[PDB]
Amino acid sequence: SRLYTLVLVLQPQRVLLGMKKRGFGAGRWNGFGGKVQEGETIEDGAKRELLEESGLSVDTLHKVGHISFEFVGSPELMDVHIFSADHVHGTPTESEEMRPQWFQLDQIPFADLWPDDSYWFPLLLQKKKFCGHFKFQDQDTILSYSLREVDSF
Ligand SMILES: Nc1nc2c([nH]c(=O)n2[C@H]2C[C@H](O)[C@@H](COP(=O)(O)OP(=O)(O)OP(=O)(O)O)O2)c(=O)[nH]1
Ligand SMILES: [Cu+2]
Ligand SMILES: [Cu+2]
């Protein structure tokens, strides 16, 4: 298993997603994040990746979710810690990896996000902390999942 982060930049009626321009999940919208490095906590990793990919800074993040990901015929698990950045400083800025864009919450193009996102985004937007596991047949196809709400992490 490998540690990753995912940070959703949320304002009362809109979210700043990023169009992944290269790498894993290229061509889909997503939150900002990446691998957690040796020598940083998960949260600091989430903050560093948000700053790097969007030019945005935060005082704090909310822990909102935790989801493990599995691909059929690959033993390597992605242990993804999901944060909400409720309040950001600075100006959204395109990076080599991400082009930030704002979407009003009822207009998020779920068709162009990872397919799991349409399952847990509703929990996110209702402020319900969640735990889950998703097993993908391929990058477009969920084979199996479980998802539940938790009171804390
Ligand atoms: N919304 C969503 N995010 C996912 C899914 N699967 C998945 O790995 N992620 C997130 C976790 C990370 O933010 C990102 C994968 O990390 P990455 O490898 O692209 O990050 P990165 O290149 O920036 O890593 P770094 O080397 O920059 O640290 O995608 C998914 O199914 N849905
Ligand atoms: Cu907050
Ligand atoms: Cu402030």
**19 Cβ contact partners less than 8 Å away, ≥ 6 residues apart:** 27, 28, 29, 98, 99, 101
Give the separation between CA 31 and CA 137, rounded to whole angstroms. 22
Per the CB < 8 A criterion, the answer to whether 32 and 54 are in contact is yes
Structure tokens at 87: 């309040």
Sign of CA dihedral 5, 58, 123, 111: negative
Structure tokens at 42: 């998960």
- Tell which one of 1, 5, 6, 112 to mutate to probe ligand 1, the residue whose CB is within 8 A of the most ligand atoms: 6
Give the separation between CA 68 and CA 66, rounded to whole angstroms. 7
**137 Cβ contact partners less than 8 Å away, ≥ 6 residues apart:** 72, 143
Q: In Å, what is the CA distance from 138 to each residue of 21, 76, 146?
A: 20, 14, 17
Per the CB < 8 A criterion, the answer to whether 145 and 132 are in contact is yes
Structure tokens at 3: 């540690």
**109 Cβ contact partners less than 8 Å away, ≥ 6 residues apart:** 29, 103
Experimentally, how was this structure solved? X-ray
* Partner residues linked to 8 by β-bridges: 84
| DSSP string computed for 45-76 | HHHHHHHHHHS-B-S--EEEEEEEEEETTEEE
Ligand number, closest to the Cα atom of 59: 3
Whether 83 is in the pocket of ligand 1, judged by its Cβ within 6 Å, is: no
Whether 131 is in the pocket of ligand 1, judged by its Cβ within 6 Å, is: no
DSSP 123: H
DSSP 37: P
Q: Which residue reads 């290229």 in tokens?
A: 26
Structure tokens at 82: 């999901």
Give the separation between CA 43 and CA 61, rounded to whole angstroms. 8
Q: Which domains does the chain have, with CATH numbers?
A: 1-153 (3.90.79.10)
- Residue 38 burial (CB count, 10 A): 6
Give the separation between CA 127 and CA 17, rounded to whole angstroms. 18
Give the separation between CA 130 and CA 124, rounded to whole angstroms. 8
